[PDB]
């Protein structure tokens, strides 16, 4: 395949559904490279568990943990890392309130080159056990020979864009990784980087991040087709923020507007949002505890009941993962019959203004609260006009492996979105348990 898009291994499904899936131990294996140093960007870490995922021969190499924790939470992370003298920490600044360091990325420096992994999983056992998660693996990037002056840049601008993303941290430990990236040849990269970083961006800087970055890439590197108004937008996520009193406040006015962009010329487009129902969670491999990783609060949900008419069940027969609750986040643009897609994005970004950005000051300023990162697959970057949808995820390689079922199925009249902080006590889950948060 050209795409290098993988799901994580799921315990408790038949082995055919893990054929070609990746566990964290596979990513860190000596088969992927002879590790010299690594950086782990994430939200949540179990350091004892993380260190055991590295092969023993690599377990003492330097590891940088890039996190967003403050106050008592920051102290706990430092206490976790203290027994491991090779572990350094970088606290990403979060100077806008209610922001999160949500980016999930590995930088892996080898004797043979450099690899970048952009994925969706926290660095805890539960996130790699029975969930649907997504991974993009970069090629092995060779070092540019000293004395040679080359850009090492790809047609998607990935090298400069990744450096720009890291520069926004203003962190000395990350300037070291910027210098590593500068020394490597990333020209084989066929995906576009879509990041979010905290700030208030005006003028052209608006196009650097969040949903305006997606809009700019779709304008410059995708083309509109006849009947484009008939091509739906699909968003699929594990958390929902406060979107406003109706769809015109943000969802259908600016978020959907960016996602429906195609080409440079200047809405009826259907919007499908995929988010687990209570029933999906109750009968999952984990049962109700899967809902601990599906944060949608009752306080937020009750403000926006209009939103739930957009909601569609989680179903993933194609990858054997209907019962592996999603922590992956994906966005894509299928054709009216769902047989082709105009693009596909895997990202950390949930359905949230904090992640994607919200316009302020009469539309002159894009405000983002959080760090997010994803990769965008555009047909043009592969010499194609569209991607065919892979019929069965694990069975021409111009076919993109969409990990869940199409078309998405609307919630039934008695279905409700999973809301994590209310009790579910009238029907036991897979393990015979009730949920009382
Ligand atoms: C509210 C929140 C906080 C952290 C995460 C995460 O990094 O897992 C999530 C998620 O992605 O569901 C959601």
Which ligand 1 atom is the nearest neighbour of the CA of 43? 7
Domain count, the chain: 2
Q: Using an 8 Å Cβ cutoff, are 39 and 107 in contact?
A: yes
Residue 379: partners with Cβ closer than 8 Å, 6 or more residues away: 222, 342, 343, 385, 386, 387
Q: What is the resolution of this structure in A?
A: 1.5
Q: Are residues 181 and 54 in the same domain?
A: yes
The torsion region of residue 277 among left (phi > 0), alpha (psi -120 to 50) and beta comes to beta
Rounded CA gap, 426 and 428, in Å? 7
Q: Are residues 236 and 176 in the same domain?
A: no
Which ligand 1 atom is the nearest neighbour of the CA of 238? 12
Q: Are residues 207 and 133 in the same domain?
A: no
Helices (H) and strands (E) in the chain, counts: 10, 19
- Look-up of token digits 């002879």: 34
Q: What are phi and psi of 304, to 5 degrees?
A: -145, 50
Cα angle for residues 286, 291, 292 (degrees, 5° grid): 100
340 belongs to an annotated ligand binding site? no
Q: Residue 384: how many CB atoms within 10 A of its CB?
A: 14
Token pair listed for 350: 């949930």
Q: Are residues 174 and 202 in the same domain?
A: no
Q: What are phi and psi of 162, to 5 degrees?
A: -65, -45
Rounded CA gap, 184 and 187, in Å? 9
Q: Are residues 117 and 209 in the same domain?
A: no
Rounded CA gap, 339 and 328, in Å? 22
Closest CA to 8 of 104, 88, 92: 104
> Experimental technique used?
X-ray
Nearest C-alpha to atom 2 of ligand 1 is from which residue?
295
Which ligand 1 atom is the nearest neighbour of the CA of 42? 7
Q: Using an 8 Å Cβ cutoff, are 23 and 151 in contact?
A: no
* Ligand 1 center from residue 148 Cα (angstroms): 42
Q: Are residues 317 and 350 in the same domain?
A: yes
Q: Residue 409: how many CB atoms within 10 A of its CB?
A: 14
Question: CA torsion, points 144, 150, 151, 154, in degrees to nearest 10?
Answer: -80
Rounded CA gap, 415 and 409, in Å? 12
Q: Are residues 93 and 218 in the same domain?
A: no
Which residues form ligand 1's pocket by a CB distance below 6 Å?
A: 43, 100, 102, 122, 238-239, 293, 295, 327, 350
Token pair listed for 10: 């799921």
Domain ends where: 139, 157, 190?
A: 190
Rounded CA gap, 325 and 408, in Å? 15
Rounded CA gap, 12 and 25, in Å? 18
Q: Residue 348: how many CB atoms within 10 A of its CB?
A: 31
Token pair listed for 8: 């994580």
Question: Residue 191 gets which letter from DSSP?
Answer: S
Q: Are residues 167 and 268 in the same domain?
A: no
CA-based torsion, 252, 255, 259, 262: positive or negative: positive
Closest CA to 326 of 316, 334, 318: 316
Ligand 1 pocket test, pick from 239, 241, 421 with the greatest ligand atom count within 8 Å of Cβ, gives: 239
Q: Are residues 298 and 395 in the same domain?
A: yes
**Residue 329 β-bridge partners:** 347
Cα distances (Å, whole numbers) of residue 80 to 46, 60, 77, 93, 211: 8, 16, 5, 20, 35
Looking at residue 292, which CATH number applies to its domain? Answer: 3.30.870.10
Q: Where are the beta strands (DSSP E) in 245-393?
A: 271-274, 311-312, 329-334, 340-347, 358-360, 365-368, 372-377, 387-389
Rounded CA gap, 352 and 10, in Å? 27
Cα angle for residues 24, 28, 33 (degrees, 5° grid): 150
Nearest C-alpha to atom 11 of ligand 1 is from which residue?
238
Residue 171: which domain range? 1-190
CA-based torsion, 421, 427, 429, 433: positive or negative: positive
Q: Using an 8 Å Cβ cutoff, are 368 and 194 in contact?
A: no
Closest CA to 296 of 416, 189, 376: 416
Q: Using an 8 Å Cβ cutoff, are 100 and 293 in contact?
A: no
């Amino acid at each position: 395949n050209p795409f290098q898009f993988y799901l994580t291994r799921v315990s408790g499904v038949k082995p055919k559904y893990n054929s070609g899936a990746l566990h964290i131990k596979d990513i860190l294996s000596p088969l992927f490279g002879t590790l010299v140093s690594s950086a782990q960007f994430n939200y949540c870490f179990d350091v004892d568990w993380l260190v055991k995922q590295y092969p023993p021969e690599f377990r003492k190499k330097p590891i940088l943990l890039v996190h967003g924790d403050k106050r008592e939470a920051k102290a706990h992370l430092h206490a976790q890392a203290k027994p491991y003298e090779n572990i350094s920490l970088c606290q990403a600044k979060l100077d806008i309130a209610f922001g999160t360091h949500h980016t999930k990325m590995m930088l892996l420096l080898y004797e043979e080159g450099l690899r970048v992994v952009i994925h969706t999983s926290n660095l805890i056992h539960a996130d790699w056990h029975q969930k649907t998660q997504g991974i993009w693996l970069s090629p092995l990037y060779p070092r540019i020979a000293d004395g040679t002056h080359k850009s090492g840049e790809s047609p998607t601008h990935f090298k400069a864009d990744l450096i720009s993303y890291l520069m926004a941290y203003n962190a000395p430990s990350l300037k070291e990784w910027i210098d590593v990236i500068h020394k490597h040849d990333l020209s084989e990269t066929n995906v576009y980087l879509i990041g979010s970083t905290p700030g208030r961006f005006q003028g052209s800087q608006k196009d650097n991040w969040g949903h305006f970055r997606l809009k700019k890439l779709l304008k410059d590197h995708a083309s509109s087709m006849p009947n484009a108004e008939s091509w739906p937008v699909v968003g699929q996520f594990s958390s929902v923020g406060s979107l406003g009193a109706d769809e015109s406040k943000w969802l259908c006015s600016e978020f959907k507007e960016s996602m429906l962009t195609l080409g440079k010329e200047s809405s009826s487009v259907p919007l499908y949002l995929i988010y687990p129902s209570v029933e999906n969670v109750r009968t999952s491999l984990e049962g109700y505890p899967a809902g601990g990783s599906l944060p949608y609060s009752i306080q937020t949900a009750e403000k926006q009941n209009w939103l739930h008419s957009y909601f569609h069940k989680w179903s993933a027969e194609t990858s054997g993962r209907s019962n592996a609750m999603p922590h992956i986040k994906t966005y894509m643009r299928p054709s009216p019959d769902f047989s082709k897609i105009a693009w596909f994005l895997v990202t950390s970004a949930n359905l949230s203004k904090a992640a994607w950005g919200a316009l302020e000051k009469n539309g002159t300023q894009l405000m983002i609260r959080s760090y997010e990162l994803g990769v965008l697959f555009l047909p043009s970057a592969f010499g194609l006009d569209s991607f065919k949808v892979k019929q069965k995820f694990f069975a021409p390689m111009a076919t993109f492996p969409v990990p869940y079922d199409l078309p998405p199925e609307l919630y039934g009249s008695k279905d409700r979105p999973w809301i994590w902080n209310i009790p579910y006590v009238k029907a036991p889950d897979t393990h015979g348990n009730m949920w009382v948060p």
